[model samples]
Target chain A: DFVTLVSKDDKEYEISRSAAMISPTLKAGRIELKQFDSHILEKAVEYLNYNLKYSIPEFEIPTEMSLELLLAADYLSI
Target chain B: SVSSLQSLCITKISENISKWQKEADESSKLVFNKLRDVLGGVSTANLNNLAKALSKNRALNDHTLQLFLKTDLKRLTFSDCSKISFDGYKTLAIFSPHLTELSLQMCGQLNHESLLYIAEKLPNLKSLNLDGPFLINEDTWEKFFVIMKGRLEEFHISNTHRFTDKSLSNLLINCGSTLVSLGLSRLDSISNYALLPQYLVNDEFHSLCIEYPFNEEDVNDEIIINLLGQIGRTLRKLVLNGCIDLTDSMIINGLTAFIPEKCPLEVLSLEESDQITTDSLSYFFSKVELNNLIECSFRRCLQLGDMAIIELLLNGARDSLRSLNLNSLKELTKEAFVALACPNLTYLDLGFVRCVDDSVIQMLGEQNPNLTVIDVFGDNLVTEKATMRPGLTLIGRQSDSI
Candidate 1:
């Protein structure tokens, strides 16, 4: 079952049916992504992609997205 | 409803691909869903991959997949696709459209629309290995090729009558120049072989598999030679299992003819081909540089004797070979087994080669540092009490399976 994730700025990402569940908040299957804007949420999932694939990645959180991504990453508990 | 018990499995089988996917049954289903809350916080994405790693056929169905399937999976394999339905196929593509390498075995139920939906939707797909999708006819295959045009690099499909010459011809017409790896096995309808090499582009092809052809289908030496002549230099993997029409000349003229002295071949398997004798293989190994070989198997090549294998081990694969299978070569000797000094060898199949005894098994266990799995299936001499290293798995020793 693919869970639809919507951004605060009206952006939507239906992440792989599996990967989005990495975030318990999104496990609702369809969540109005309110806390984070599109860009930060997008970056949040990119990090999840690398982490869950068994690839040990030294991820890059660009200077601008660091605080927001960290907050979102904490919210997701990834 | 299930939880982090899946991750406990990950910790258990972390360094290894699950070895018992075939054994996934009612017990797995019961324990899998039942133990969810015991471990929390593990993503179902990781849980599903491990689930797939452990479950191949019966335990997994559309309903269970609904419970386990994850969103961001990029690579997935489903065996025994009979259990899943049309919507299940669409859900997989919808769920994991980013999947580049996907294998669906025994998916004869994979309908025309689902096949089209997969080709059109999964734009990132490059390797689509399928089996028994015979329900779709020739035109549908053409449609699949058209949509997957210039995208697919590796295409392997077998056990379908509907995958006709028209389908293959269409494949070449659309994806031929970009194709690198191709596997064709037991597609009873496709008899034509002439179009193979002419359409296959140069320097791009690396792997080819055409095995277990229909009894009368034209799997002959000339096409093999011609195809080898075109791509042999760049070919890294070659598997010609159960293609009885192939002979010693196929090697003499086809392989050695096209391949350079310093061969690029890394994996060579000629399992179940009875015609290839020691003469051609020994000559092929000695002449063709086998320093690049990583996996070599000659199971049931009855004609191969002591020296042919010895030459392969000593002169060719002594250091580079990682996996070797010399199963069922009845004529081999204990001394022949002695040449198996491939330091990197991890898996060896000395099954049914009568010469294998306690001494040979002990020596093999001691010499090959990385040796992990060995099959001594029929050797009565290999005692059940043979002392083996802690990690080494020695299977199939006489009545052990008896």
Candidate 2:
């Protein structure tokens, strides 16, 4: 119920509000939308910058562009 | 803390820089840090000569920096400098302030007052990197720039928790020009400057990495649009991991809007941007036209579906894109995997994507001689996870989630 929705291209898409909202079937984090604008980008950038302090640096080219997904992998049965 | 880790990092950097100084007469050296290392000692004589090298690039050679610091060169890095007292500032001061490049990593004890020395002394210096150096509050902004004076090329002041918007404004006004690379990964104060550095407009640098966690005010969408509008043509590598302010349009349209005739944009990592739809991304390169792209990672843009991804891979700029990552994008389809192919690519990561089955994995391995670092790790269909590539490293893990 904590999920959120927005109409894009005249269609509605429901997205989870928090990582906890993700389906148990996947055991991963929830998906937040990136309208790809300044506000969301700024927040995403800020969250990522904060995490570099604690996250391990993978020298090889990183697999993902989003830190949220990195956290998702952490939650996965690695 | 970064200070303790920096101590270990400093030694390796010192050694690498020293060796690089010997092999290449060039003045630039990049030392990437790994966490939790020990500090190497530096000799005072080495420090003196290293300082001398900054001016003439002639005096200091391999062992001089070790001699100048008089401490284990290996023991000091951006992190170690943080753990220890900021005594190194005085040593740096002893070396002429006019030296063009200065990297003081891990000097946690190093304070903005050190800028007092730098401002007064190093008038001609061009580049400055203080890796997790010190806490510079908002009030200290003017004083910090009074000395820096816009000559910086590469500036890195990461993890300054107290950084504020005013401090960021000062940085942009002062050191925002001529920067080939800048790292403000953890400085949350600039959450307002959805408008990135103005320097990005005229001057394109090789690397730009920024991670803004939060801002003092409410985050808005216009800020991301403003920020993306500023990205210039020369930017080759961009890493924006947690910029929540961004939407799909800002990235797709904002970036593609200014397609340089010739761009070295080889690497792009924008993982956590969930708001970014595949519609923009899949169609991005197709619209603008890029030729030199080699690597791209779109880790967790879950809204991006299989059809969009495949369409992008097959028609839109797939020819130039050698490496593509769709990790955690479960909605992706098997057709998308089949469509994804780049002859020059040596690296591909499909970790956690449900659409890629065993056949897809085999097809990629068999078809692309350059397939390396494939993450069929959790695919139910793929039995044999990965195989070696010609010139790259290949790794595969068993599916735990599947």
Predicted model with the maximum TM-score? 1
Classified by CAPRI criteria, candidate 2 counts as: incorrect
**What's model 1's lDDT at B254?**
94
Scored against the native two-chain complex, candidate 1 gets a DockQ of 0.01
Model 1 over residues B1-402: C-alpha lDDT tens digits?
A: 665998878878954544454244334544545434323323435443434532542655677565443345566777667777888888777656567878888786789988987997787899999998878999999989999988989999999888889999999999988899999998888887668898787476899988787763387888888899889888999998887788998999999888888888899999887888988988878887788899989999988898889878766678899999989998888888777776789999988888888888888888898887889898888886787764576778556775
**For residues B114-147, could you state the per-residue lDDT of candidate 2 as single tens digits?**
7667556666666667766546567776677645
Off by over 4 Å in 1: A1-78, B1-51, B66-70
Cα displacement (angstroms), candidate 2, residue B300, comes to 0.9
